[PDB]
Tab-separated table of C-alpha atoms and ligand atoms in Angstrom:
chain	number	residue	atom	x	y	z
A	1	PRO	CA	1.355	-20.528	-8.008
A	2	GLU	CA	0.208	-20.175	-4.268
A	3	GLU	CA	-0.585	-16.386	-4.027
A	4	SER	CA	-4.090	-18.544	-4.687
A	5	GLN	CA	-3.766	-19.601	-0.785
A	6	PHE	CA	-2.656	-15.924	0.609
A	7	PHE	CA	-5.233	-14.568	2.720
A	8	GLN	CA	-4.504	-11.247	4.417
A	9	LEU	CA	-6.805	-8.665	6.279
A	10	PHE	CA	-6.458	-5.713	5.952
A	11	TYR	CA	-8.407	-3.297	8.932
A	12	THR	CA	-8.179	0.710	9.102
A	13	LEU	CA	-9.578	2.138	12.483
A	14	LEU	CA	-9.556	5.865	12.169
A	15	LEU	CA	-11.346	6.737	15.582
A	16	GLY	CA	-11.959	10.762	15.485
A	17	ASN	CA	-13.139	12.164	18.316
A	18	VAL	CA	-14.811	10.113	21.425
A	19	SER	CA	-17.652	9.349	19.788
A	20	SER	CA	-17.144	8.513	16.777
A	21	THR	CA	-14.578	5.414	14.210
A	22	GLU	CA	-14.979	4.931	10.831
A	23	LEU	CA	-14.111	2.076	9.478
A	24	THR	CA	-12.653	-0.568	6.779
A	25	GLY	CA	-11.251	-3.408	6.029
A	26	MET	CA	-11.341	-5.759	2.790
A	27	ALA	CA	-10.161	-9.924	3.111
A	28	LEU	CA	-8.330	-10.698	-0.300
A	29	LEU	CA	-7.060	-14.380	-1.779
A	30	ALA	CA	-4.561	-13.931	-3.962
A	31	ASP	CA	-5.530	-10.072	-5.287
A	32	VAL	CA	-9.237	-11.043	-5.434
A	33	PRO	CA	-11.171	-9.289	-2.758
A	34	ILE	CA	-13.738	-11.746	-1.469
A	35	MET	CA	-15.444	-10.027	1.403
A	36	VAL	CA	-15.393	-6.004	2.427
A	37	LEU	CA	-16.789	-4.395	5.438
A	38	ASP	CA	-19.585	-2.222	5.003
A	39	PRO	CA	-18.128	1.149	6.745
A	40	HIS	CA	-22.167	2.036	8.181
A	41	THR	CA	-23.325	-1.002	8.602
A	42	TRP	CA	-19.926	-2.419	9.856
A	43	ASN	CA	-21.116	-6.257	8.172
A	44	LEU	CA	-18.561	-7.871	6.361
A	45	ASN	CA	-19.975	-7.918	2.422
A	46	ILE	CA	-19.285	-10.687	0.083
A	47	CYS	CA	-17.933	-9.642	-2.831
A	48	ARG	CA	-18.308	-13.083	-4.770
A	49	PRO	CA	-21.233	-15.017	-5.626
A	50	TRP	CA	-19.359	-17.884	-4.583
A	51	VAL	CA	-18.029	-16.882	-1.356
A	52	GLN	CA	-21.266	-17.120	0.313
A	53	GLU	CA	-22.196	-20.273	1.170
A	54	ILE	CA	-19.280	-21.969	2.059
A	55	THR	CA	-17.724	-19.957	5.649
A	56	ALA	CA	-20.525	-19.279	6.848
A	57	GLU	CA	-19.564	-23.258	7.933
A	58	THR	CA	-15.910	-22.009	9.737
A	59	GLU	CA	-17.649	-19.205	10.640
A	60	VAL	CA	-14.459	-16.708	10.115
A	61	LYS	CA	-17.409	-14.176	9.449
A	62	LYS	CA	-17.987	-14.700	13.494
A	63	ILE	CA	-14.414	-14.920	14.364
A	64	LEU	CA	-13.844	-11.003	12.951
A	65	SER	CA	-16.823	-9.069	14.295
A	66	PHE	CA	-18.503	-10.977	17.606
A	67	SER	CA	-14.835	-12.871	18.360
A	68	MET	CA	-12.336	-11.855	21.549
A	69	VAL	CA	-10.274	-10.600	18.286
A	70	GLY	CA	-13.220	-9.127	16.271
A	71	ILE	CA	-14.151	-6.093	14.950
A	72	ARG	CA	-16.398	-4.974	17.836
A	73	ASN	CA	-13.784	-5.386	20.628
A	74	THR	CA	-11.010	-5.054	18.684
A	75	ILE	CA	-12.429	-0.223	18.176
A	76	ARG	CA	-12.809	-0.167	22.322
A	77	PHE	CA	-9.722	-2.215	22.533
A	78	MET	CA	-7.995	0.955	20.257
A	79	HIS	CA	-9.654	3.747	22.280
A	80	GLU	CA	-8.676	2.153	25.661
A	81	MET	CA	-5.524	2.304	24.725
A	82	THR	CA	-5.617	5.940	23.179
A	83	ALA	CA	-7.203	6.669	26.706
A	84	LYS	CA	-4.570	4.977	28.754
A	85	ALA	CA	-1.339	6.096	26.721
A	86	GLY	CA	-2.882	10.236	27.028
A	87	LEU	CA	-3.232	10.599	23.493
A	88	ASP	CA	-6.127	12.935	21.863
A	89	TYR	CA	-7.364	12.012	18.660
A	90	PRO	CA	-7.698	11.966	16.175
A	91	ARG	CA	-5.292	8.188	16.092
A	92	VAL	CA	-5.677	6.653	12.689
A	93	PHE	CA	-5.062	2.285	13.620
A	94	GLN	CA	-4.480	0.453	11.734
A	95	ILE	CA	-4.120	-3.668	10.984
A	96	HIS	CA	-2.399	-6.549	8.703
A	97	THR	CA	-2.963	-9.994	9.352
A	98	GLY	CA	-2.184	-12.898	6.641
A	99	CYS	CA	-2.013	-16.463	6.359
A	100	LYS	CA	-0.295	-18.740	3.387
A	101	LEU	CA	-0.482	-22.014	1.946
A	102	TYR	CA	2.981	-23.491	1.183
A	103	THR	CA	2.081	-26.997	-0.931
A	104	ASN	CA	5.157	-28.375	1.745
A	105	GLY	CA	3.281	-28.053	4.625
A	106	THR	CA	4.377	-25.244	6.013
A	107	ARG	CA	2.205	-21.779	7.339
A	108	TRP	CA	2.912	-18.633	6.921
A	109	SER	CA	1.261	-15.999	9.894
A	110	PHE	CA	0.903	-12.979	11.119
A	111	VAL	CA	-0.347	-10.152	12.779
A	112	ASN	CA	0.760	-6.184	12.440
A	113	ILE	CA	-0.438	-3.341	14.355
A	114	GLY	CA	0.237	0.117	13.262
A	115	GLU	CA	-0.439	3.734	14.711
A	116	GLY	CA	-0.563	6.779	12.816
A	117	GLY	CA	1.089	4.587	9.239
A	118	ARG	CA	4.219	2.887	11.236
A	119	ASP	CA	4.523	-0.067	12.770
A	120	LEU	CA	3.423	0.250	16.408
A	121	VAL	CA	3.232	-3.612	17.800
A	122	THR	CA	4.052	-8.257	16.023
A	123	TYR	CA	2.657	-10.355	17.578
A	124	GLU	CA	4.999	-13.760	16.739
A	125	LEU	CA	3.046	-17.100	17.163
A	126	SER	CA	6.128	-18.500	18.546
A	127	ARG	CA	6.865	-17.124	21.468
A	128	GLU	CA	3.358	-16.760	22.266
A	129	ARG	CA	3.982	-13.146	22.513
A	130	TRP	CA	3.196	-9.557	21.508
A	131	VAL	CA	6.907	-7.093	20.259
A	132	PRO	CA	7.022	-3.558	19.543
A	133	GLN	CA	7.723	-2.062	17.201
A	134	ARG	CA	8.533	1.290	17.910
A	135	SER	CA	10.356	2.502	21.915
A	136	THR	CA	6.878	4.978	23.651
A	137	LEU	CA	4.608	4.086	25.596
A	138	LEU	CA	1.503	3.794	23.147
A	139	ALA	CA	3.759	0.480	21.725
A	140	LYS	CA	4.695	-0.857	25.983
A	141	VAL	CA	1.157	-0.382	27.361
A	142	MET	CA	-0.390	-2.307	23.928
A	143	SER	CA	2.438	-5.362	23.677
A	144	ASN	CA	2.046	-5.478	27.177
A	145	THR	CA	-1.776	-5.852	27.518
A	146	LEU	CA	-1.916	-8.301	25.051
A	147	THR	CA	0.586	-10.304	25.720
A	148	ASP	CA	-0.030	-10.657	29.431
A	149	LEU	CA	-4.091	-11.507	27.763
A	150	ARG	CA	-2.335	-15.473	27.368
A	151	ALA	CA	-7.000	-16.275	25.937
A	152	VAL	CA	-6.162	-13.752	23.213
A	153	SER	CA	-2.976	-15.694	22.343
A	154	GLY	CA	-4.263	-19.492	22.675
A	155	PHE	CA	-7.394	-17.931	20.393
A	156	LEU	CA	-4.838	-16.815	17.716
A	157	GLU	CA	-3.207	-20.131	17.593
A	158	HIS	CA	-6.223	-21.714	17.098
A	159	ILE	CA	-7.626	-18.880	14.288
A	160	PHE	CA	-4.143	-19.254	12.866
A	161	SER	CA	-3.803	-23.543	12.623
A	162	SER	CA	-7.333	-24.708	11.946
A	163	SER	CA	-9.554	-22.297	11.182
A	164	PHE	CA	-7.973	-19.513	8.322
A	165	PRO	CA	-6.165	-22.324	6.732
A	166	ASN	CA	-9.894	-24.642	5.889
A	167	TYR	CA	-10.959	-21.769	4.828
A	168	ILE	CA	-8.118	-20.912	2.160
A	169	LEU	CA	-8.693	-24.779	0.816
A	170	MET	CA	-12.392	-24.641	1.126
A	171	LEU	CA	-12.285	-20.908	-0.751
A	172	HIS	CA	-9.642	-22.598	-3.462
A	173	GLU	CA	-12.196	-25.365	-3.484
A	174	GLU	CA	-14.627	-22.744	-5.221
A	175	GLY	CA	-13.177	-19.819	-6.283
A	176	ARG	CA	-11.851	-20.708	-9.855
A	177	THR	CA	-13.422	-18.848	-11.943
A	178	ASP	CA	-11.456	-15.885	-10.267
A	179	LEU	CA	-8.268	-17.621	-8.556
A	180	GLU	CA	-7.358	-19.783	-12.608
A	181	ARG	CA	-8.255	-16.388	-14.883
A	182	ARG	CA	-6.171	-15.950	-17.112
A	183	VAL	CA	-6.288	-12.986	-19.759
A	184	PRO	CA	-2.743	-12.319	-21.239
A	185	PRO	CA	-1.040	-8.933	-21.896
A	186	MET	CA	-0.609	-6.733	-24.801
A	187	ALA	CA	2.082	-3.950	-25.253
A	188	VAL	CA	3.269	-1.451	-28.202
A	189	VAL	CA	6.044	0.433	-28.487
A	190	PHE	CA	6.599	3.792	-28.993
A	191	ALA	CA	9.269	7.325	-28.903
A	192	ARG	CA	9.628	9.836	-27.160
A	193	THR	CA	11.398	13.438	-26.472
A	194	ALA	CA	13.711	12.605	-23.710
A	195	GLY	CA	16.567	15.521	-22.851
A	196	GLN	CA	20.366	15.614	-23.323
A	197	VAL	CA	19.584	14.768	-26.947
A	198	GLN	CA	17.969	11.091	-26.501
A	199	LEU	CA	15.154	9.267	-27.078
A	200	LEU	CA	12.478	7.578	-24.837
A	201	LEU	CA	11.126	4.181	-26.324
A	202	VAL	CA	7.932	2.796	-23.821
A	203	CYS	CA	6.375	-0.055	-24.570
A	204	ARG	CA	3.332	-0.006	-22.346
A	205	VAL	CA	1.941	-3.945	-21.569
A	206	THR	CA	-1.879	-3.473	-20.827
A	207	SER	CA	-5.155	-5.862	-20.562
A	208	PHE	CA	-3.049	-9.348	-18.105
A	209	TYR	CA	-4.210	-11.148	-15.787
A	210	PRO	CA	-2.230	-12.418	-13.292
A	211	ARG	CA	0.081	-9.561	-11.348
A	212	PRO	CA	3.560	-10.464	-11.750
A	213	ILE	CA	5.368	-9.799	-15.365
A	214	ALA	CA	7.988	-9.641	-16.845
A	215	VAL	CA	9.179	-6.992	-19.273
A	216	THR	CA	12.758	-6.129	-20.970
A	217	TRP	CA	14.556	-4.760	-23.470
A	218	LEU	CA	16.237	-6.383	-26.225
A	219	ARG	CA	18.905	-3.968	-28.328
A	220	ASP	CA	19.829	-6.681	-31.271
A	221	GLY	CA	18.189	-9.348	-29.160
A	222	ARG	CA	20.093	-9.093	-26.286
A	223	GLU	CA	19.009	-8.369	-22.807
A	224	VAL	CA	19.789	-4.924	-22.387
A	225	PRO	CA	21.103	-5.467	-18.184
A	226	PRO	CA	19.693	-2.072	-16.051
A	227	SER	CA	21.314	0.764	-15.988
A	228	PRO	CA	19.763	4.835	-15.416
A	229	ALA	CA	19.192	3.824	-19.048
A	230	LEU	CA	16.380	1.872	-17.934
A	231	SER	CA	13.090	1.743	-15.817
A	232	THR	CA	10.557	-0.609	-16.016
A	233	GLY	CA	7.889	0.689	-13.787
A	234	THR	CA	4.905	-0.111	-11.108
A	235	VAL	CA	2.273	-2.735	-12.365
A	236	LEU	CA	-0.677	-0.535	-12.061
A	237	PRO	CA	-4.770	-2.167	-11.292
A	238	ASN	CA	-7.490	-1.817	-14.200
A	239	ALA	CA	-11.127	-1.808	-12.544
A	240	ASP	CA	-11.848	-5.183	-13.736
A	241	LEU	CA	-9.284	-6.471	-12.098
A	242	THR	CA	-6.559	-6.807	-14.973
A	243	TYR	CA	-2.921	-4.518	-14.745
A	244	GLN	CA	-0.745	-1.992	-17.057
A	245	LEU	CA	3.145	-1.106	-16.925
A	246	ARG	CA	5.019	0.980	-18.619
A	247	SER	CA	8.673	-0.242	-19.434
A	248	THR	CA	10.732	2.699	-20.324
A	249	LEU	CA	14.431	2.796	-21.863
A	250	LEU	CA	16.362	5.798	-23.337
A	251	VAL	CA	18.703	4.901	-26.468
A	252	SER	CA	20.535	7.445	-28.913
A	253	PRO	CA	18.818	8.819	-32.240
A	254	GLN	CA	20.533	7.198	-34.946
A	255	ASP	CA	22.861	4.045	-33.034
A	256	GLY	CA	22.575	1.509	-35.659
A	257	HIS	CA	20.845	-0.474	-33.088
A	258	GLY	CA	17.283	-1.960	-33.410
A	259	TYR	CA	15.018	-2.505	-30.126
A	260	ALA	CA	12.135	-4.730	-28.806
A	261	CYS	CA	10.478	-4.866	-26.221
A	262	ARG	CA	9.951	-8.306	-24.933
A	263	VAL	CA	6.872	-9.157	-21.833
A	264	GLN	CA	7.070	-12.812	-20.353
A	265	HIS	CA	3.122	-13.787	-18.676
A	266	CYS	CA	2.310	-16.846	-17.035
A	267	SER	CA	-0.330	-17.196	-19.978
A	268	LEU	CA	1.517	-16.977	-22.413
A	269	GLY	CA	2.990	-19.825	-21.689
A	270	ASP	CA	6.422	-20.582	-23.347
A	271	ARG	CA	5.602	-17.602	-26.010
A	272	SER	CA	6.724	-14.218	-25.388
A	273	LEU	CA	6.098	-11.031	-26.073
A	274	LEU	CA	7.852	-9.739	-29.013
A	275	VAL	CA	7.142	-6.098	-30.481
A	276	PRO	CA	10.042	-3.945	-32.448
A	277	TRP	CA	10.539	-0.303	-32.148
A	278	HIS	CA	9.578	0.364	-36.081
A	279	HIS	CA	10.467	4.371	-36.755
B	1	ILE	CA	3.759	10.563	8.828
B	2	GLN	CA	1.696	12.559	6.149
B	3	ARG	CA	2.793	11.173	2.921
B	4	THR	CA	1.520	13.572	-0.195
B	5	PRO	CA	-0.221	10.570	-2.634
B	6	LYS	CA	1.325	9.966	-6.288
B	7	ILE	CA	-0.982	10.416	-9.197
B	8	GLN	CA	-1.427	8.860	-11.659
B	9	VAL	CA	-3.657	8.750	-14.594
B	10	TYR	CA	-4.407	6.365	-17.535
B	11	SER	CA	-6.535	5.004	-19.825
B	12	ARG	CA	-7.711	1.147	-19.699
B	13	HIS	CA	-6.611	0.716	-23.530
B	14	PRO	CA	-4.537	2.742	-26.132
B	15	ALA	CA	-6.624	5.419	-26.995
B	16	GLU	CA	-8.841	5.778	-29.713
B	17	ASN	CA	-10.459	8.965	-30.578
B	18	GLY	CA	-13.852	6.985	-30.987
B	19	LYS	CA	-13.655	4.354	-29.040
B	20	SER	CA	-15.167	3.547	-26.034
B	21	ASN	CA	-12.415	3.404	-22.932
B	22	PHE	CA	-12.308	3.452	-19.533
B	23	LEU	CA	-10.064	6.947	-17.891
B	24	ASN	CA	-8.115	5.712	-14.242
B	25	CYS	CA	-7.348	7.811	-11.618
B	26	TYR	CA	-5.087	5.701	-8.978
B	27	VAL	CA	-3.942	7.604	-5.602
B	28	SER	CA	-1.858	5.772	-3.863
B	29	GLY	CA	1.515	6.479	-0.833
B	30	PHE	CA	-0.973	8.335	0.945
B	31	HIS	CA	-1.839	8.810	4.628
B	32	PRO	CA	-3.898	9.899	6.322
B	33	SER	CA	-7.095	8.021	4.091
B	34	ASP	CA	-9.205	11.279	4.059
B	35	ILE	CA	-9.198	12.151	0.207
B	36	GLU	CA	-10.699	14.261	-1.945
B	37	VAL	CA	-10.704	13.071	-6.455
B	38	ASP	CA	-12.649	14.147	-8.841
B	39	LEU	CA	-12.290	13.128	-12.831
B	40	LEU	CA	-13.018	16.081	-14.869
B	41	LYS	CA	-13.225	16.316	-18.313
B	42	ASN	CA	-12.345	20.302	-20.681
B	43	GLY	CA	-12.405	21.468	-16.455
B	44	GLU	CA	-15.755	19.802	-15.311
B	45	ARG	CA	-16.361	17.288	-12.594
B	46	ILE	CA	-17.859	14.117	-14.438
B	47	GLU	CA	-20.709	12.742	-12.774
B	48	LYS	CA	-20.456	8.581	-13.016
B	49	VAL	CA	-16.988	8.116	-11.115
B	50	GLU	CA	-16.294	4.217	-9.496
B	51	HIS	CA	-13.879	4.015	-6.859
B	52	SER	CA	-12.222	0.588	-5.376
B	53	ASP	CA	-12.691	0.068	-1.503
B	54	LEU	CA	-10.101	2.169	-0.080
B	55	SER	CA	-7.456	-0.357	0.743
B	56	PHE	CA	-2.833	-0.239	2.142
B	57	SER	CA	0.024	-1.532	1.376
B	58	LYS	CA	2.644	-2.967	3.138
B	59	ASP	CA	4.390	0.457	4.065
B	60	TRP	CA	0.822	1.365	5.708
B	61	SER	CA	-0.022	3.868	3.111
B	62	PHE	CA	-2.700	3.696	0.972
B	63	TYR	CA	-4.356	3.325	-2.353
B	64	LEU	CA	-7.122	3.809	-4.137
B	65	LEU	CA	-8.644	3.297	-8.012
B	66	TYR	CA	-11.025	6.149	-9.452
B	67	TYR	CA	-12.424	5.289	-12.707
B	68	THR	CA	-15.487	5.933	-15.298
B	69	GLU	CA	-16.017	5.143	-18.576
B	70	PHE	CA	-15.416	7.332	-21.035
B	71	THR	CA	-14.437	8.266	-25.237
B	72	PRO	CA	-12.026	10.366	-25.724
B	73	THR	CA	-12.712	12.906	-28.505
B	74	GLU	CA	-10.114	15.205	-30.504
B	75	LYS	CA	-11.331	17.924	-28.291
B	76	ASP	CA	-12.194	17.327	-24.648
B	77	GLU	CA	-9.323	17.417	-22.233
B	78	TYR	CA	-9.434	14.737	-19.214
B	79	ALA	CA	-7.509	15.147	-16.278
B	80	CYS	CA	-7.399	14.234	-12.435
B	81	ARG	CA	-8.581	16.441	-9.332
B	82	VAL	CA	-7.092	15.616	-5.879
B	83	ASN	CA	-7.309	17.057	-2.696
B	84	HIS	CA	-5.305	16.307	0.332
B	85	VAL	CA	-4.019	17.488	3.893
B	86	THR	CA	-0.840	17.378	2.315
B	87	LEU	CA	-1.487	19.761	-0.415
B	88	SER	CA	-2.207	23.578	0.089
B	89	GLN	CA	-5.008	23.223	-3.750
B	90	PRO	CA	-5.448	20.736	-5.096
B	91	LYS	CA	-3.714	19.082	-7.597
B	92	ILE	CA	-4.767	18.539	-11.547
B	93	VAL	CA	-2.580	15.617	-13.078
B	94	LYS	CA	-3.969	15.702	-16.779
B	95	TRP	CA	-4.212	12.125	-19.098
B	96	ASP	CA	-1.402	11.998	-21.304
B	97	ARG	CA	-3.216	9.526	-24.083
B	98	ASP	CA	0.092	7.967	-24.018
B	99	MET	CA	-1.036	6.591	-20.389
C	1	PLM	C1	-7.897	-11.765	12.876
C	1	PLM	C2	-6.806	-11.253	14.152
C	1	PLM	C3	-6.645	-10.678	15.380
C	1	PLM	C4	-5.999	-9.170	15.187
C	1	PLM	C5	-6.846	-8.317	15.788
C	1	PLM	C6	-5.201	-6.662	16.702
C	1	PLM	C7	-5.577	-7.392	18.494
C	1	PLM	C8	-6.753	-6.694	19.010
C	1	PLM	C9	-6.994	-6.999	20.666
C	1	PLM	C10	-8.720	-5.892	21.504
C	1	PLM	C11	-9.536	-7.388	21.226
C	1	PLM	C12	-8.591	-7.675	22.945
C	1	PLM	C13	-10.304	-7.438	23.190
C	1	PLM	C14	-10.886	-6.249	24.214
C	1	PLM	C15	-10.488	-5.703	25.367
C	1	PLM	C16	-11.024	-4.673	26.141
C	1	PLM	O1	-12.124	-3.898	24.898
C	1	PLM	O2	-10.856	-4.009	26.854
C	2	NAG	C1	-17.425	14.175	16.499
C	2	NAG	O1	-17.182	13.599	15.189
C	2	NAG	C2	-18.669	13.999	14.164
C	2	NAG	C3	-18.091	14.224	12.699
C	2	NAG	O2	-16.358	13.936	12.765
C	2	NAG	C4	-18.881	14.841	14.415
C	2	NAG	O3	-21.221	14.896	14.027
C	2	NAG	C5	-19.394	14.741	16.152
C	2	NAG	O4	-20.254	15.605	16.963
C	2	NAG	C6	-18.262	15.177	17.596
C	2	NAG	N1	-18.614	14.383	18.867
C	2	NAG	C7	-18.569	15.307	19.080
C	2	NAG	C8	-19.286	17.093	19.482
C	2	NAG	O5	-17.462	15.463	20.730
C	3	NAG	C1	-22.887	-3.564	1.093
C	3	NAG	O1	-23.955	-4.169	0.463
C	3	NAG	C2	-24.275	-3.133	0.748
C	3	NAG	C3	-25.818	-3.842	0.012
C	3	NAG	O2	-26.780	-4.406	0.556
C	3	NAG	C4	-24.699	-1.889	-0.864
C	3	NAG	O3	-24.769	-0.468	-0.348
C	3	NAG	C5	-22.814	-0.772	0.164
C	3	NAG	O4	-22.711	-0.092	-0.683
C	3	NAG	C6	-22.050	-2.840	0.306
C	3	NAG	N1	-20.638	-1.698	0.964
C	3	NAG	C7	-19.788	-1.998	0.671
C	3	NAG	C8	-18.039	-2.150	1.117
C	3	NAG	O5	-19.357	-4.031	0.652
C	4	NAG	C1	8.808	-25.844	2.552
C	4	NAG	O1	8.697	-25.063	2.783
C	4	NAG	C2	8.617	-23.743	3.046
C	4	NAG	C3	8.413	-22.521	2.085
C	4	NAG	O2	8.583	-23.130	0.628
C	4	NAG	C4	10.427	-23.776	2.906
C	4	NAG	O3	11.290	-22.477	4.093
C	4	NAG	C5	11.007	-24.672	3.993
C	4	NAG	O4	12.646	-24.950	3.219
C	4	NAG	C6	10.288	-26.366	3.312
C	4	NAG	N1	10.996	-27.688	3.334
C	4	NAG	C7	11.577	-28.884	2.588
C	4	NAG	C8	12.210	-28.913	3.542
C	4	NAG	O5	10.771	-28.488	1.448
């Protein structure tokens, strides 16, 4: 759908001591890594053979590295706010940015900064303002310095209105080999011991791409509604950009119901994957 | 805030003795980001282990996938060993073949 036109940036600035920064950062379109920051060199590694000779042209790679809001300035801005807040090292800062394009015209864009793994300040595009997320000095100082920097506010506007939208569009056109790949799930059902004289039925679903999926249990062919008896796990990644999930249902032994796991996934179309529990 | 890692150990495909597979250790929900993860075979560190690029979720907490090609056997035990500032000692999670 439109997960494919969702561009995100994740940056971690671990400020060890005064002379030490360790960086990580990633750019994603959907769940496909497009660029990864190399911690040793601070250059943007390109992750896909279809990504390289495209931008390039929009110089997103220049924006992220050398510009007013680029990593080189950001690192120094973060060292400075730690300093101007009287705070001590180590400090970990994080930056989460996104741009989504809906196929009705509208865009969702955001910039979030955290410190120590909690929100710190957010950027309000419409209000041309950075907003504090916590109620202390570091939050007040960073939010005020950023909002006062009217050129930064202007620069971010252009970024989210022009630069990132054009980039998504070009990447979308070039990257279908990853963005439109479909690999159907396979599933297995088995039973294991559980407490209170119950059985745990497990449906393990593997190998699937893209990520969204729905796994339900059927009791005599009708959907089991959610209760404490039913747990669907979190989706887990494989190294090959496929996913795995486990769903479980507590049942009483010899209850006289037949059970099956049903898996709905867009790669399957109108047909579900249906997997009976057999004793 | 500090957050201790969730550690989930699983294979790529449902396991069958003698057929190659991938062993995965997914560590997630941790803060700060420094972490050490080893995959073990019969108690000893496996040498050729890859991992994904560190990133983080909406709640700011970090996640990493470590993985290795392996061939399960009846006699061999596999596990994931994690160290993190929130742990007093490394946490070992054995691979449950159901996973
Ligand atoms: C690509 C999205 C940009 C969002 C980056 C987070 C905002 C940090 C801005 C800091 C850069 C300001 C210029 C440096 C000034 C200085 O070093 O004092
Ligand atoms: C800063 O940190 C690094 C290692 O994390 C260390 O080697 C370096 O000497 C430190 N600098 C000082 C002395 O502040
Ligand atoms: C980036 O590329 C170089 C190869 O030129 C490689 O050695 C390095 O590990 C890469 N790093 C990342 C994290 O992409
Ligand atoms: C356009 O799409 C956005 C997001 O899906 C939505 O918020 C907005 O209401 C839509 N406008 C219309 C009326 O199509």
